Amino acid sequence: MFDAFTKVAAQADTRGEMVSVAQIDALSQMVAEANKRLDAVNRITANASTVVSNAARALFAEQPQLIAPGGNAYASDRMAACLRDMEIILRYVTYAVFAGDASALEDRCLNGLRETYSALGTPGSSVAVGVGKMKEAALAIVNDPAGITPGDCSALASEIAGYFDRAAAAVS
Amino acid sequence: MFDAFTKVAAQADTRGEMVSVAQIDALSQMVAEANKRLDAVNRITANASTVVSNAARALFAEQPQLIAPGGNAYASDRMAACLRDMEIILRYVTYAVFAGDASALEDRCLNGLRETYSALGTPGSSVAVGVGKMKEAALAIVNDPAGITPGDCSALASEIAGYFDRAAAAVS
Amino acid sequence: MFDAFTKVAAQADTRGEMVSVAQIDALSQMVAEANKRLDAVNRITANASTVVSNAARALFAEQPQLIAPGGNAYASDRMAACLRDMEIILRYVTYAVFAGDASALEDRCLNGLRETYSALGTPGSSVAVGVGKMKEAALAIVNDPAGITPGDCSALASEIAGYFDRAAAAVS
Amino acid sequence: MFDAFTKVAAQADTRGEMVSVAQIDALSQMVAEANKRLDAVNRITANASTVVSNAARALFAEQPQLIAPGGNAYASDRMAACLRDMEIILRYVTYAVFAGDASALEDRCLNGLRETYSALGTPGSSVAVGVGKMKEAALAIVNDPAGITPGDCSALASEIAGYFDRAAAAVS
Amino acid sequence: MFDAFTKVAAQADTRGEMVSVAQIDALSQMVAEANKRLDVVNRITANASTVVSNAARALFAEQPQLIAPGGNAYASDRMAACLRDMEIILRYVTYAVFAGDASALEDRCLNGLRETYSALGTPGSSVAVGVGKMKEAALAIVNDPAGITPGDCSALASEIAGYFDRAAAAVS
Amino acid sequence: MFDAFTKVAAQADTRGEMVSVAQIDALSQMVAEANKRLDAVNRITANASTVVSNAARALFAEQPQLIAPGGNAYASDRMAACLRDMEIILRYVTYAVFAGDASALEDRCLNGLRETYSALGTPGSSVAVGVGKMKEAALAIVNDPAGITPGDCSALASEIAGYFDRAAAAVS
Amino acid sequence: MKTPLTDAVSTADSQGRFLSSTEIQVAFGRFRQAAAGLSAATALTSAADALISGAAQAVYNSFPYTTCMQGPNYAADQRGKDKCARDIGYYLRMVTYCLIAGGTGPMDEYLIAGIDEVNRTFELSPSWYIEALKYIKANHGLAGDAAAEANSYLDYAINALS
Amino acid sequence: MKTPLTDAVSTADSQGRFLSSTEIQVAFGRFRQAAAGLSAATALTSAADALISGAAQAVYNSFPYTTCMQGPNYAADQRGKDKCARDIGYYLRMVTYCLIAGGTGPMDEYLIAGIDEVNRTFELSPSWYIEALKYIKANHGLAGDAAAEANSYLDYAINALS
Amino acid sequence: MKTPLTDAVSTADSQGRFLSSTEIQVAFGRFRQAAAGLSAATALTSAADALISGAAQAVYNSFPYTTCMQGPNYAADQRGKDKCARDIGYYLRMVTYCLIAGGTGPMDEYLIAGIDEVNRTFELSPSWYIEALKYIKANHGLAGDAAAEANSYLDYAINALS
Amino acid sequence: MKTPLTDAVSTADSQGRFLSSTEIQVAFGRFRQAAAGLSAATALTSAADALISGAAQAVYNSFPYTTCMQGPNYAADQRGKDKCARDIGYYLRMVTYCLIAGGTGPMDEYLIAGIDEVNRTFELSPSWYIEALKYIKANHGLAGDAAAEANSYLDYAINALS
Amino acid sequence: MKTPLTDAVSTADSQGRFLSSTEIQVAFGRFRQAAAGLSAATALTSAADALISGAAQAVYNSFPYTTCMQGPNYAADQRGKDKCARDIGYYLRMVTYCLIAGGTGPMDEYLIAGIDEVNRTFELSPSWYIEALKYIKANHGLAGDAAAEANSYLDYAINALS
Amino acid sequence: MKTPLTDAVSTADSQGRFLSSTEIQVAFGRFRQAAAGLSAATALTSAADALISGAAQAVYNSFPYTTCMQGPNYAADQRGKDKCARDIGYYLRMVTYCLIAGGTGPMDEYLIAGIDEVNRTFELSPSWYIEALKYIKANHGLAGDAAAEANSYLDYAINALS
Numbered sequence A, B, C, D, F: 001m002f003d004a005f006t007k008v009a010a011q012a013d014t015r016g017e018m019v020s021v022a023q024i025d026a027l028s029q030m031v032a033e034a035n036k037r038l039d040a041v042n043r044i045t046a047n048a049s050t051v052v053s054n055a056a057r058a059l060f061a062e063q064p065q066l067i068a069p070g071g072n073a074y075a076s077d078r079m080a081a082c083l084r085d086m087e088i089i090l091r092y093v094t095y096a097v098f099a100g101d102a103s104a105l106e107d108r109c110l111n112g113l114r115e116t117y118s119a120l121g122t123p124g125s126s127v128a129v130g131v132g133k134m135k136e137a138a139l140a141i142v143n144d145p146a147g148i149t150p151g152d153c154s155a156l157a158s159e160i161a162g163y164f165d166r167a168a169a170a171v172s
Numbered sequence E: 001m002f003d004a005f006t007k008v009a010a011q012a013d014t015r016g017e018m019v020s021v022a023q024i025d026a027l028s029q030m031v032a033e034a035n036k037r038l039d040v041v042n043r044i045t046a047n048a049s050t051v052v053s054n055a056a057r058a059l060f061a062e063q064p065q066l067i068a069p070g071g072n073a074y075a076s077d078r079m080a081a082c083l084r085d086m087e088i089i090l091r092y093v094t095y096a097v098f099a100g101d102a103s104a105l106e107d108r109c110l111n112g113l114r115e116t117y118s119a120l121g122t123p124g125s126s127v128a129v130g131v132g133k134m135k136e137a138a139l140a141i142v143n144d145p146a147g148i149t150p151g152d153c154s155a156l157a158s159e160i161a162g163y164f165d166r167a168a169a170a171v172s
Numbered sequence G, H, I, J, K, L: 001m002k003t004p005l006t007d008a009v010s011t012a013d014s015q016g017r018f019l020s021s022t023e024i025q026v027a028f029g030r031f032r033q034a035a036a037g038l039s040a041a042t043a044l045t046s047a048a049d050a051l052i053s054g055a056a057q058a059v060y061n062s063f064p065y066t067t068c069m070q071g072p073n074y075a076a077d078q079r080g081k082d083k084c085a086r087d088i089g090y091y092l093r094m095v096t097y098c099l100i101a102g103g104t105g106p107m108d109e110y111l112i113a114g115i116d117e118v119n120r121t122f123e124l125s126p127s128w129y130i131e132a133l134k135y136i137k138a139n140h141g142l143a144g145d146a147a148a149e150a151n152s153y154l155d156y157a158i159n160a161l162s
């Protein structure tokens, strides 16, 4: 896996070059917004089970065929598995944010997931909707102005959305 | 795997329904002929190495190229492997009869077997003839009137033939 | 795997025949040149790390793109891996000479290697060039008249060339 | 492990003898009371988590030092482990009753248990008290006249007491 | 394992108490000298292989019987194993300093070491002399006034000496 | 394990010495009688199942309490295990002879065997008698003048007796 | 999928052996029980609606807060009132399934595995469901072996949930 | 040690669970069969000597060479004649054990495991024992379930040697 | 025992290597956070009683049935009323331990592992404890890093019991 | 496939190392023995038919029942008389193969692995084959190393079949 | 790829858990050091050529034979003189990467893994490279945390090469 | 401990089989070679001092810096001058042991395993020892098989060290 620094170091090495004055500044700047990134991780994390459970409930209300007998989330075994996945996707999303690089998420979670679902008969599209619902709840939680030093978190929120968005793209 | 009961419970559940008075009766009747089913299993089992060894012998006599040097049953390693296969297919046939459902046989023995034989160069069609000879010897043993309370076993016989038949179909 | 004897016994067995007096003589004669074969193996082995390292050096001088940053042999991990392969191919060539049959080499080394290289992005054609350079150095080492009983090793040298050649053909 | 039948067969074999008309009758009688034995197993099992939880509660109320910070059942990890042990002991007692022989319990549960508790510092004597409470509740549950065909279960009840007793003896 | 903090939380928990204002101050002060502790870790680490190799050389000079043919450090296998131990003990000593608590060292290194050596016929006392030499070189390295902010490291040095000393005592 | 050569190289190494003109001679001599040693191994091996079976038969005739119901060699499981041991002991004796050093036998077979038998209740003294019978039959076989170049094999016979004797001593 | 028949087959197959008189004896026991079991299933099926409302109602009585507390895990609205009956329905349907199969298999596989995570996640109390099953026991009205066996599954649910 | 009861417990224990109605059904099976089983055992025990000589003699008829060949694997002396009856005895005794335990367990453990090595090592032909077992089938004189079950073990031995 | 320090050591030890600048960075992070953390612990400890009664009281308000139902899982008597405060006490005490250690370790080991079994076995509802934790959040009255950190552990407990 | 050469390469490959003087000494051994071995093979091949009938005939003498009992495992008809010789032929052929390969390999792989199952299944007696091999030993008429080495394989077969 | 951030993610992932305040503390440490680290890298980059020649020349001074021996492992020709500067260049470049990443990761992966085989194969002496690194320490001219950090990596290379 | 005899026993033991003609052929090979081997060992032993000084002096010639550099890894003093001879001594002694044992075993075990670590740790160059070994080849003055075999061990050390 890469983190933001390490991703740059990788690319420079394949060129045999030292990181340029520009690219060091780019990283420097990402360091200066460190605190907002960590708030971003703490807040999503510190609310993970609400984010999951509410998204799961909305999804099932929206898509009853999923929990009707016969559907892919019917049976305790399967419902539990499904909740477990929502939770897993969210966990990897937070890793990506913390590291400031999508790789943890691409490599250890999304890659091959689409094929897994297809083999099982899990409707990936439905997972995507779930992932999508978690994205909104997550973002609203990172953007809440209560109890934090006011500032702009818009670029970070864009980054966070991105990670969610690729998770939804990857299953589906 | 399913047994007769469990096969019907599986289908009822994907519908979210309780088994219908009709379907409970069909099971109930299968119960009432339980004893003949068990004889069927005891008799085939209690004669398994005869059923196998006789079938194998007739096969080789019928198909010399199998045991001629160069052939797929030549070499002790391969001959032993071949009898072992006869024996295995019969073992799984009796499981199926006992449970009253073809799944044990389908899932743990037949599935992929065609492709195994193909890769190895085992003539599946030859296996089928072996399977077939076993089928006849089996059926004659279950149908023998000696030492058993007289009754109709024809339906059961038809079931048992079924299992053998798909075993022959599946390699081939 | 087969050795020279065992390769012949295998073919005889699929025909169900005893080795013919002609074939026994062929082997007999391969026995009588036993000592030269063994010298062939001792000399190549007793010089393996020179054979390797020189060929690898020639190769890199000839092909600087390999070790330029970005190239398949750049990074200590990769360079080491590359030297390792040279050495392995050599090891398996000597095994083939010793046994007097290409199988050790075909089965445990060459088979699937082309596809391995392709997946990784190692330029097989380069490996072949490496293999070619080792072949020459190896051959020169077996042929060197110093400190050995004078005699004709040309048939053996032809066999040894053979094994190198297929190693080169198999990657590439 | 042995069950009632098998325990006798074992002893007859070390003597090279066939079971005696007397010992067959003894087993035959144990066969005739089968139904009560199985009710014993079903009733204790069908109430296991009551049996365990109530005994666990009476024990802690009786022995507060156990759950005082610092005591062997303090910390969730440890409480859970302790409940788990009560439940294990009860499980193996019911195996013993069902098989009609103490071995399952002796071999797989009690043997070395005393030394395990001693090393950990679990107070065995406390475990014994727990086991004893479970014994009373179990017995009261097997003896309850409601909803069963009236009969004498006194000898069985004595056997069941036995198994609990050696569990208490084994650990203390 | 425990670190300084964690060791005090463990002891408070077995008493069911919150850490006293005195004990919090004690830790607070240990926090205030954090930087010095880390320098020591960095300094011993960044010199590990000189610390090891010099101690090993001094030891063998002082104790030739160890490297005379027949002695426990004769044979490359054994010499390498011996240096490897030196290096391990040191590695665990630095862990202990970093965590501010002997446990990493006691639990994962020293414990059972005496018995291992005895079984192998490694002279433990010798190892202790080796550990001793490392202790001196280590301490001199942490105490060196060059290139550091001047200040009192005496208490810490006394802590570090302690870990070494118990390593010595534990083998022996 | 050591072989005759390697046992001497081991001793010289702990002295830091080159083998003495005397000890090279001793080995040189053991080389010159190589051929007898190998016959010794061929003959015992080529008669291994006769050696074993006949000894086991004589032993049981001699000691019926072994195969009486209740005895340690009663039950197929046990009888088979017992033949198996006879065979193993003989297999390791022949390795000893082949290597010209008792270690293969000491290290991988005899060591701890006495304690194994003790725990199981196998009468080691009986095993020794078995071993003893094998010893005689073996010796008689190696000494037979039929079909070999005449010569003295008495030193070698004394060696072989030695290896049997310590097997006998080791269990017992 | 724990049932006498598939359990028997399963051990035999894992020991690579044909079925012996042991497994025939297993089938005997099953087929003997099956008469009581299949009847019990027919009985429970035809009292299905009485048993479900009954039970749901019993739960609401033991735990009246469940009918007033706002929020999704509870039954203060019709939505929840429906989830609840659905769930009790599921428990009862599984019990019929177990009676038919002759084992816990179907409930183990459709209901039990994972129940802990569902109830934790959605904040549903096992106590509530224990009361439903207790009512089903008290009110199924079965006699003889039907009853002893049906109660065995009801009680097993209770054990799983406790 | 394959018997309905210990098999039952064994699976339960290996899955870490209490015994359910499935295993109760296994025991019903066992206890029902026991009636026939124990009777058959009693019967075989009382015809023990007639059965053994009978069988031994049958063997010597099907295979007359066995009473003339010199050497220890055969019955041309009393010693061997005695070993032979002993062994047939062993077979019969195990069959009674199997009838009592309600499974092949005892025969599996005391006789079958290792048999192939014993007969290879001591040069004894499985064909001989097969003939003994066939004779015990034809001559035990049992009726109904006692017969069907005892025969099941007799055939099992025959399948194992074979 | 998840803390920055023991975690850093743990990975190094499991990769067989000396501590590098990475683990020194871990320690920096830890020692910097420690200032706020140790404060927050001192604060919480002094407000210990107000917080616990406040919390218990909160729970009894959200869930009035817990002060009237008979039976040992509830707080209608003083015995229960005291178990309840004890438990909330334990939660809070773990929260201080986490603050001091700089990680969830002490809560993971003393309270979290096994909780699911205790609550199931003794029929305690996670929802009650969540409410207690929510109240501690609203009423600890901490500012700045102390607050963000303490809340992280209060929320973690909430996530573990969900 | 157990021969000096493949055995040598095998160990080396499994230790990941080039061939050392040890493996050169193995080959020396092999190539030195080959002279005798290849001779022996030529000799046995030329006496193939005399040796096979001879042996077959020896077996029929030791075991005359084999030429009169009905049924397929025996040689009372021409069919069986032919199978028998075919098998004896197989044994001899394998012995030549070993002589050529310089080890048991070919016989291990083509004949020995699985033999126990074939003979049990088809009710052939190992004692019969043993007598055939014994005959081949007595009658091959080889001298010196050719004899010592052929005999080693003939005895190996006997050991495998004991 | 050992850096504070990836190391933290990695443990969390390997224990299947969301990041806790421990990992946030790791990040804090990293981001606080980064200030010094990024500086030191810019600094080293800009003194790149002076440092490389400097070091190369240092090595030639400690080990003059390296500029006179014939043959490819030495720097008596321009070819070798170039290889050498290249390699020192590589070492320094990795040090800057370490500084940027805040861990040994990049050097671990691009340079250290396999160095032992390269040097053994091509007959380069680690002593030479140790001298180069020693020079870069004495002459980089950084102060405070940038110094202590860069030195940590320079010393780490030395330890790997010792 | 790689020698023809122990290697042969080892495979056989790992395959659980008695020694067959293959392993006899291995021993043939070994015993045949031993004649040349034991001679070569006696020869090298008697030329021990001329070979060691000669060798040491060769190294000092190829690498004169090793006799003037200060510090412990070099031989500018008598202490070093001695270590160096001792080590060359060790190499030669191992070569005699390999000659005696008929394989690399003794050198693999007493000298080769771990060499890499010693040389890295104590900063000794493999190139030095490679020159000592080359000298021993050029000057042992052995003929025929003794020479081809001794050289095979001298070249092996060189391969391990290169």
Ligand SMILES: *[C@H](C)[C@H]1/C(=C/c2[nH]c(/C=C3N=C(/C=C4\NC(=O)C(CC)=C4C)C(C)=C\3CCC(=O)O)c(CCC(=O)O)c2C)NC(=O)[C@@H]1C
Pocket (backbone or CB within 6 Å): D032, D033, D034, D035, D036, D038, D039, D040, D042, D142, D143, D144, D145, D148, D149, D150, D151, D152, D153, G033, G144, G145, G146, G148, G149, G152, H021, H024, H025
């Ligand atoms: C002693 C524990 C108490 C007692 C027992 C008792 N039971 C019976 C009769 C039967 N018991 C069963 C048990 C089961 N039936 C099932 O279906 C299941 C699960 C599938 C079980 C465990 C059965 C089938 C019977 C047969 C007839 C009947 O229903 O009564 C008796 C009669 C004696 C007998 O041995 O059968 C007795 C004495 N009775 C008491 O008074 C004690 C409280």
